[PDB]
Amino acid sequence: SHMWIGVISLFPEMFKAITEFGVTGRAVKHNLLKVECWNPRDFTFDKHKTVDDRPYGGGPGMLMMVQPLRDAIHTAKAAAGEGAKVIYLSPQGRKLDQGGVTELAQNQKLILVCGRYEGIDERLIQTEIDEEWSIGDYVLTGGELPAMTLIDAVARFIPGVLGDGLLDCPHYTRPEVLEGLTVPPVLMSGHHEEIRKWRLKQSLQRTWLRRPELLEGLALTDEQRKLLKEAQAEHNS
């Protein structure tokens, strides 16, 4: 009924974007979702609060310094108590999709470690991280946007937060005519079953035209096979 997410980040104020606004902001205010951040800079001891360090072997960039990051992670783990899964966000991780969101959402506690600079020491991944997850095959400046993405996606599964393999159907609202384009008459018919079938058929058609590989992974129902065949025949004029 409740999810707790610990976050380790050099920029914890970024997480206001999900804790103060919208559906996820409401979830936090209503105690359905709790997001708690620890900043490695607070675990430094030198006068200039150093949180990066030079990579062995040379190279352009810097890495996160091990001692402050490690101490922040340990503090988060102590706060979480038993049973928290520790996740490092990176492009080398398991690719996130909705199946994986649904899996992650089964956890009552997560700790999310956000890398900065060129990333974190490999031995910390070995000794502190349970799983690595990627939000997609593109490179970002840090792990915070992937962590927020993951939080937002799992939050949708917490009961009370909100009020099947296919792409969504098109949606229409007022006015009935917009730049000469009319709303499909079936949607104004009030025929609930025709509307259901139209929506399903559109989703099948859109998945086939835009993401046909997604169909290969589905066991279509008899009704879905029929509506898809119909959509494909109509497309073939």
Add this chain to the structure above:
Amino acid sequence: SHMWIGVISLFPEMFKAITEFGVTGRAVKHNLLKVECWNPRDFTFDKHKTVDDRPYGGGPGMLMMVQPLRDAIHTAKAAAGEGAKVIYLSPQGRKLDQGGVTELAQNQKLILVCGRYEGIDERLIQTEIDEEWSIGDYVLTGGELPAMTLIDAVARFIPGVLGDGLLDCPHYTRPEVLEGLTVPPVLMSGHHEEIRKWRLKQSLQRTWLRRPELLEGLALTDEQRKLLKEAQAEHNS
């Protein structure tokens, strides 16, 4: 040398997460990146500033109301002047990867439209949007985190913002021994060519073990073929 990004969002304060922090915050402060937000709520005229509307055909949710959203988009387009590409973020869009980031980054101006609720009227996509892009196959509560993700990814290509198909290699920094785990000696050798080859070989090995489909899409160099063959022979003990 400069990128301008117009944003249409009901929660423009979320974009502080990228405009006030880190590498992207520095890019904004130094005028390399400009992010400008318009909020549909500011284009409403009724007393309670309504920005949602009921979907034709029924259904659980709401859609963004057309008139305020449309007016916000028109205002952003007027601000952009000629040549801005207008992007709607959604799971029905083209899947973002680094090739697509590099393509988007060729644009001097982008306008990013962030959906909320169940999304936006299909006729607005037809009449106002140039391209739809997805950051991945998972469902979020709105388009803002995908828009920020996209901004962060393209920002890395603006000259001055920062100081090949494979996953990254492991990275190490101090201490030389951490929980009994030592830094690989090659990285402490100072032999720049051995270090280069070790890194490349690790990237090839990691891509093969974690994401083998990514290799099928590459024309490996002779050196890469060799190091991959070596890594695969060592794995086969």
